[PDB]
Amino acid sequence: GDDRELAILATAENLLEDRPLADISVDDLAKGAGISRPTFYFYFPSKEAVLLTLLDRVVNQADMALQTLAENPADTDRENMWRTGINVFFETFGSHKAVTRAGQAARATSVEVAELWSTFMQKWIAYTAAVIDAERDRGAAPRTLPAHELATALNLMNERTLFASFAGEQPSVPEARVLDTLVHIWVTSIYGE
Amino acid sequence: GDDRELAILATAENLLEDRPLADISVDDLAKGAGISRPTFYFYFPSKEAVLLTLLDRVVNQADMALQTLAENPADTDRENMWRTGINVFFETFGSHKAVTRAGQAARATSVEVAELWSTFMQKWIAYTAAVIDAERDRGAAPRTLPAHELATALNLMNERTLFASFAGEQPSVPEARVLDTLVHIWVTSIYGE
Numbered sequence: 035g036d037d038r039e040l041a042i043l044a045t046a047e048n049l050l051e052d053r054p055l056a057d058i059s060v061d062d063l064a065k066g067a068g069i070s071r072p073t074f075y076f077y078f079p080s081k082e083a084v085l086l087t088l089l090d091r092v093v094n095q096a097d098m099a100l101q102t103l104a105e106n107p108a109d110t111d112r113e114n115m116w117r118t119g120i121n122v123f124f125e126t127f128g129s130h131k132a133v134t135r136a137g138q139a140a141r142a143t144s145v146e147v148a149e150l151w152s153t154f155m156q157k158w159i160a161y162t163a164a165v166i167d168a169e170r171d172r173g174a175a176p177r178t179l180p181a182h183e184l185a186t187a188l189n190l191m192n193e194r195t196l197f198a199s200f201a202g203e204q205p206s207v208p209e210a211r212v213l214d215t216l217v218h219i220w221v222t223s224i225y226g227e
Numbered sequence: 228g229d230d231r232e233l234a235i236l237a238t239a240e241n242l243l244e245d246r247p248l249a250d251i252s253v254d255d256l257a258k259g260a261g262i263s264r265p266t267f268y269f270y271f272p273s274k275e276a277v278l279l280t281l282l283d284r285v286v287n288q289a290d291m292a293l294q295t296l297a298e299n300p301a302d303t304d305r306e307n308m309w310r311t312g313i314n315v316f317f318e319t320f321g322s323h324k325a326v327t328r329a330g331q332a333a334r335a336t337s338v339e340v341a342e343l344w345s346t347f348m349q350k351w352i353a354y355t356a357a358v359i360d361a362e363r364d365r366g367a368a369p370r371t372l373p374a375h376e377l378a379t380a381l382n383l384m385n386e387r388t389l390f391a392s393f394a395g396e397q398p399s400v401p402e403a404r405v406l407d408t409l410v411h412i413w414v415t416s417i418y419g420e
């Protein structure tokens with residue numbers, strides 16, 4: 035049932051708005067999707083697999099959007115171009131705050147969640163490194179740090195800063211200031227001597 | 228028993244090198260400290276309180292070292308000065324990797340751990356913001372982003388980058404490259420137009 039699986043995922047994202055995964059039971063997901071507990075278990079082996087699927091969907095949505103942008107870059111200056119790409123993650127994770135938050139909490143306890151996050155961060159960092167490489171090859175960025183190490187810290191910064199902001203952690207940058215903040219630190223560190 | 232409590236904390240830090248807190252039992256801490264289980268419970272209510280005390284000790288050690296440096300700044304240029312301060316956290320958390328790692332895992336499940344981390348990050352970010360303010364007042368740094376928002380992202384970057392490095396996460400900057408990486412991104416973003 036494409037619909038029954040989707041109903042489960044929809045309920046899980048809705049419930050995660052209100053509590054952590056530890057406080058949502060399989061019976062809760064089933065009730066919300068209009069199904070029995072054993073029917074639930076035909077579609078997912080555990081409420082953890084539900085979170086893993088929700089996170090996979092969000093990570094691929096962000097990845098697909100970055101691939102589109104990479105094929106269709108904005109015709110504007112460097113700063114606004116980097117803003118556009120960082121915005122892909124700001125708007126994609128920011129429209130799925132509860133999934134994002136729960137997926138991060140899970141990295142500690144779930145090998146598959148951890149792996150899924152790893153895989154995509156590796157990809158995103160390799161792409162950032164290749165852009166910085168191209169920028170250096172064009173003579174637009176100086177050859178300062180190793181591009182992949184610079185890319186790794188800047189992507190890590192974005193991961194921690196975006197997610198603190200969407201969780202309203204203390205300390206955090208306000209959500210309405212976070213793009214400006216990250217784009218400044220990316221531009222100054224990639225183009226600065 | 229100042230010694231019995233210390234023996235408990237020493238065992239916990241030693242065991243956390245090998246497994247997560249979830250796989251260390253109260254009986255394990257007691258055996259390692261040469262005490263019985265109920266004696267253990269006279270000193271700490273739970274193995275979680277042991278981790279909280281271990282983390283408090285590490286956070287205060289880092290905070291005290293930064294306060295010393297702030298009173299006794301290095302006589303060298305801006306870059307090397309910022310390197311010295313970031314190094315306080317590199318060497319302090321880096322000499323307590325297992326406590327650091329477990330303390331981060333715990334932020335998700337423990338209000339007190341979360342609070343303790345928050346308190347100190349707030350302090351460290353306020354201090355960074357005040358240095359950037361002073362640098363702008365001296366005319367050495369330009370007035371670009373709000374200093375406290377810049378300080379917050381750069382401290383968050385350090386938190387996530389240092390801890391990925393010490394955990395050998397994939398992706399991470401190699402531990403032997405992380406100071407250079409962070410100091411470049413701090414200097415370029417604080418002094419760059």
Ligand SMILES: CC(C)[C@H](N)C(=O)N1CCC(c2nc(-c3cccs3)no2)CC1
Pocket residue numbers: 103104107108112115116117118119120123158159161162165169189192
């Ligand atoms: C950004 C400039 C150098 C390039 N001309 C361009 O427009 N694009 C390549 C960079 C790309 C981008 N990626 C990213 C991110 C990758 C990882 C986190 S943010 N941010 O912007 C946007 C499109």
Ligand SMILES: CC(C)[C@H](N)C(=O)N1CCC(c2nc(-c3cccs3)no2)CC1
Pocket residue numbers: 296297300301305308309310311312313316351352354355358362382385
């Ligand atoms: C750094 C310059 C502007 C100042 N003259 C100085 O030497 N100090 C103030 C900054 C201080 C410092 N703090 C930090 C960090 C604070 C938070 C994370 S790192 N890094 O360096 C070192 C001493």
